[PDB]
Structure 1
Amino acid sequence: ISNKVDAMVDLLDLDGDSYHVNARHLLYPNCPVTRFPVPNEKVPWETEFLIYDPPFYTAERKDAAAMDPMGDTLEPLSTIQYNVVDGLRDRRSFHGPYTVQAGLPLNPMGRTGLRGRGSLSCFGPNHTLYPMVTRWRRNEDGAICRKSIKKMLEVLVVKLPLSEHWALPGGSREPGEMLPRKLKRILRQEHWPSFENLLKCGMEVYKGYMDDPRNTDNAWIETVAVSVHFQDQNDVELNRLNSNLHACDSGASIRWQVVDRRIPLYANHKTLLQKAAAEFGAHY
């Protein structure tokens, strides 16, 4: 009775967001360079108003106004051209022709509150792709492996020794951009043979803008998503592409990992995997 009256004394006292977010942080991966606050309403300058002023900052390593090892610049230097193809730097946009209003480019998907490129080595939209290889999560036999009623995938991810996350093998086109469709991370991570032949006929998941945390107000990463998918259980290709793992980067771990909404992948990689896991009716 004493424990139930206490249960009664306490009982009687009862009387749209779609703009790029991961790029509008407070800090930037290196050095203080704190960004300027920009609320959601004020992200598209197309139909918004000024009274902001971003803290100009550029190239982060060698020479803000030269960046000679990285190739370009615009320091009241016309020189550069933001259209068609140009020399080894596409500088095009998969979101239509953008604006060169202030002489420097502008990331169309909104004003994320800085002036100069942080680390992206080109004011033009850098181009990169992330080929994810997926297998159907076989158990001890064919079967498949459904989570509740939907099938489950397994992607290949690599964890760099010092990096605290996992990433889909990606990269950015090294010596040249017309040169192999055979990205640098995979090259370092796999002995390049016919992954090119496999990728050329892959399915295109997402051509669009990547919400990298390194966009400032220009030099924004857009990407193309190629997703080669393997159906059989072993195949000459599965067994070959499991036996072709050299890596050997002193701690670089390449383990097959199941797909879910709880993978330690970066946020952009996770949303790309979400996009890629809808074409095949995966679990995610």
Structure 2
Amino acid sequence: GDSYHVNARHLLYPNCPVTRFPVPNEKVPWETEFLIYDPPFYTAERKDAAAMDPMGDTLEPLSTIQYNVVDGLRDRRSFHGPYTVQAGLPLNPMGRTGLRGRGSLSCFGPNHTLYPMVTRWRRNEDGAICRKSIKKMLEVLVVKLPLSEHWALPGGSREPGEMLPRKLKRILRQEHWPSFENLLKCGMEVYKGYMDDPRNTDNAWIETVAVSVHFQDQNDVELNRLNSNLHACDSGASIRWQVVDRRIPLYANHKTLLQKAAAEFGAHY
């Protein structure tokens, strides 16, 4: 199977009763000839307002923002490379999605968000690291919202830069202590760039930063402060640690992050 964005090519775009054009694996990349490509032009109704981009109907000359550069409050520049622009509209760098317009994303091009992951070891009753057949066990702190039916990483939209730690964790972690954890959020990076999503059009896609904060010792240290920063539920259902596995019940694309995360430490899968 060729590594394509099959979750974006997925039919029946979420929360909008529209269908997209059938794009098979030969048809996906922009280089190959595909003449009958007729992607419908569709944007969400709430994409003509404020903060979010007014380029939903960008046949008008309202499309005047700077492309692959930080155009003011929206740092519209890709982590992957300089994206090609046609008729004042960006194209998806990975291939055809079969759906034109803005969709449900904020702005054109990439939409920069953040997903941080906290990893720790799994100790037994004595306090030594538990093991599968060759590798070891990892535990990660994940959160379930009451209206998602899917456990997810604690990462939100990076509309602010350094407050996106707090914006992901305003209902979850804290207010004052959240800035203290944002000070400690400078860790090690794993993967940055394009990420698969069902809310991806030909013009709007999601690029992300994957930082990995880790706890080595499982005794008394920073973790007691992370457990002491628990003001867990303001508008969320539950939040807890969870042991890693391939059959980990999570959001669909986020497992693709963890398959890149467990390679950085040597866990099992």
Normalising by the residue count of structure 1, what TM-score does the alignment of the two structures yield?
A: 0.84
Range moving further from structure 2, 24-33 or 172-181: 172-181
Once the two structures are TM-superposed, the CA of residue 75 in structure 1 deviates from its matched residue by: 3.6
Once the two structures are TM-superposed, the CA of residue 243 in structure 1 deviates from its matched residue by: 1.8
Over the matched positions of the two proteins, sequence identity in percent amounts to 100
Q: Deviations over 1:104-140 (max 9, x none)?
A: 1111011111001221111131111211101101121
Contact residue 169 and residue 178 of structure 2 kept, 8 A: no
- SS in structure 2 of the partner of residue 53 of structure 1: coil
Range moving further from structure 2, 171-180 or 240-249: 171-180
Match of 1:81 among 61, 66, 74: 66
Once the two structures are TM-superposed, the CA of residue 60 in structure 1 deviates from its matched residue by: 3.8
Rounded to whole Å, the distance in 1 between the matches of 2:220 and 2:145 is 29
Once the two structures are TM-superposed, the CA of residue 74 in structure 1 deviates from its matched residue by: 6.5
Once the two structures are TM-superposed, the CA of residue 161 in structure 1 deviates from its matched residue by: 0.3
Structure 1 residues 84 and 258, CA gap change in structure 2 (3 angstroms) = same
Once the two structures are TM-superposed, the CA of residue 73 in structure 1 deviates from its matched residue by: 6.2
Contact residue 157 and residue 164 of structure 2 kept, 8 A: no
- SS in structure 2 of the partner of residue 194 of structure 1: helix
Once the two structures are TM-superposed, the CA of residue 266 in structure 1 deviates from its matched residue by: 1.5
Q: Deviations over 1:124-166 (max 9, x none)?
A: 3111121110110112122101111200100111111011101
Structure 1 residues 64 and 213, CA gap change in structure 2 (3 angstroms) = farther
- SS in structure 2 of the partner of residue 241 of structure 1: helix
Match of 2:224 among 219, 239, 245: 239
Report the number of matched residues. Answer: 269
Contact residue 25 and residue 213 of structure 1 kept, 8 A: yes
Once the two structures are TM-superposed, the CA of residue 171 in structure 1 deviates from its matched residue by: 0.6
Contact residue 107 and residue 219 of structure 1 kept, 8 A: yes
Once the two structures are TM-superposed, the CA of residue 67 in structure 1 deviates from its matched residue by: 5.4
- SS in structure 2 of the partner of residue 126 of structure 1: strand
Contact residue 45 and residue 111 of structure 1 kept, 8 A: yes
Rounded to whole Å, the distance in 1 between the matches of 2:63 and 2:263 is 44
Structure 1 residues 255 and 93, CA gap change in structure 2 (3 angstroms) = same
Rounded to whole Å, the distance in 2 between the matches of 1:119 and 1:188 is 27
Match in the other structure for 1:120: 105
Match in the other structure for 1:163: 148
Range moving further from structure 2, 182-191 or 198-207: 182-191
Range moving further from structure 2, 54-63 or 24-33: 54-63
Once the two structures are TM-superposed, the CA of residue 272 in structure 1 deviates from its matched residue by: 0.3
Once the two structures are TM-superposed, the CA of residue 63 in structure 1 deviates from its matched residue by: 2.7
Structure 1 residues 181 and 98, CA gap change in structure 2 (3 angstroms) = farther
Contact residue 172 and residue 232 of structure 2 kept, 8 A: no
Once the two structures are TM-superposed, the CA of residue 249 in structure 1 deviates from its matched residue by: 3.5
Contact residue 88 and residue 178 of structure 1 kept, 8 A: no
Contact residue 190 and residue 247 of structure 1 kept, 8 A: no
Contact residue 172 and residue 184 of structure 1 kept, 8 A: no
- SS in structure 2 of the partner of residue 116 of structure 1: strand
Rounded to whole Å, the distance in 1 between the matches of 2:57 and 2:72 is 11
> Quick check: 1:36 aligned with 2:9?
no
Range moving further from structure 2, 251-260 or 182-191: 182-191
Which structure dedicates a bigger proportion of its chain to strand?
2
Rounded to whole Å, the distance in 2 between the matches of 1:75 and 1:17 is 37
Rounded to whole Å, the distance in 2 between the matches of 1:202 and 1:59 is 37
Structure 1 residues 70 and 111, CA gap change in structure 2 (3 angstroms) = closer
Once the two structures are TM-superposed, the CA of residue 238 in structure 1 deviates from its matched residue by: 0.7
Once the two structures are TM-superposed, the CA of residue 208 in structure 1 deviates from its matched residue by: 2.1
Contact residue 43 and residue 112 of structure 1 kept, 8 A: yes
Rounded to whole Å, the distance in 2 between the matches of 1:35 and 1:219 is 15
Rounded to whole Å, the distance in 2 between the matches of 1:177 and 1:137 is 30
> Considering only aligned residues, what root-mean-square deviation do their CA atoms show, in Å?
2.9
Once the two structures are TM-superposed, the CA of residue 183 in structure 1 deviates from its matched residue by: 3.9
Contact residue 71 and residue 121 of structure 1 kept, 8 A: no
Structure 1 residues 181 and 249, CA gap change in structure 2 (3 angstroms) = closer
**Gapped runs of 5+ residues in structure 2?**
none
Contact residue 165 and residue 182 of structure 2 kept, 8 A: no
Normalising by the residue count of structure 2, what TM-score does the alignment of the two structures yield?
A: 0.89
Higher-Rg structure is 1
Range moving further from structure 2, 238-247 or 44-53: 44-53
- SS in structure 2 of the partner of residue 61 of structure 1: helix
